[PDB]
Structure 1
């Protein structure tokens, strides 16, 4: 009777949202996102959590601000962001969602931690 569904994905396109192309946002796409996207642990993070497919009916009860690298990649390619901080916040939301939903010893958490370490190493060099 009652089907579980996924929420609409986060907005990747809004012509009326203020947006800029900055050196920092270019670095976030060409260096930061590119590095994490190709990482051996990227696969769970390359698209919204599909709670229907993965049989996680509780995921979107716990995680109220979903984020993932597929969304971030589209945002960067679509010039969705006003500043680097908005994009950094999306990465932080993605990692934090994983830590919140799962338990500290879990494989998925180990994966997120490795991606986060690389992320922090790259944003240490954010230009400007």
Structure 2
């Protein structure tokens, strides 16, 4: 029922890059999803205490959210675009794993994911 430590957003010994694909992931992908009317439940780690989801972290072992992704991108945490794309996919997957099919939160994730897929389709060549 308690919250775990959040995912890391800094690791000084993890090697980093700033590539045009990672720049696109911040400037286009994250910014598009962040501003959406359905972004709010995904803008920070799930607070299982405030939201009264005492089983959330029993089920979700790889938490991810856009607050974390935003910080990772701003702090150049990633080596490659695939790591960041995986974080978005983990976020959506967690939502679909935890929640009841057809719930409104699942519709919210689906709307963000549709946009994510449209943007990733045009990921620039390195």
Counterpart CA distance in 2 for 1:76 and 1:52 is 27
Deviation at 1:110, TM superposition (A): 0.2
Secondary structure, aligned partner of 2:118: helix
Q: Give CA deviations for 1:6-27 in whole Å, capped at 9, x if unaligned.
A: 1000000011101100000000
Counterpart CA distance in 2 for 1:89 and 1:8 is 20
* Aligned ranges 1:9-28 → 2 under 5 Å: 9-28=6-25
Deviation at 1:86, TM superposition (A): 0.1
Deviation at 1:5, TM superposition (A): 1.9
TM-score, normalization: structure 2?
Answer: 0.98
Q: Give CA deviations for 1:42-77 in whole Å, capped at 9, x if unaligned.
A: 000000000010011100000000000000000000
User: What are the ranges of 5 or more consecutive residues in structure 1 without an aligned counterpart?
Assistant: none
Q: Give CA deviations for 1:81-103 in whole Å, capped at 9, x if unaligned.
A: 00000000000000000000001
Deviation at 1:104, TM superposition (A): 1.5
Secondary structure, aligned partner of 1:56: coil
User: What are the ranges of 5 or more consecutive residues in structure 2 without an aligned counterpart?
Assistant: none
TM-score, normalization: structure 1?
Answer: 0.96
Counterpart CA distance in 2 for 1:15 and 1:27 is 23
Counterpart CA distance in 2 for 1:23 and 1:86 is 14
Alignment match, 2:115: 118
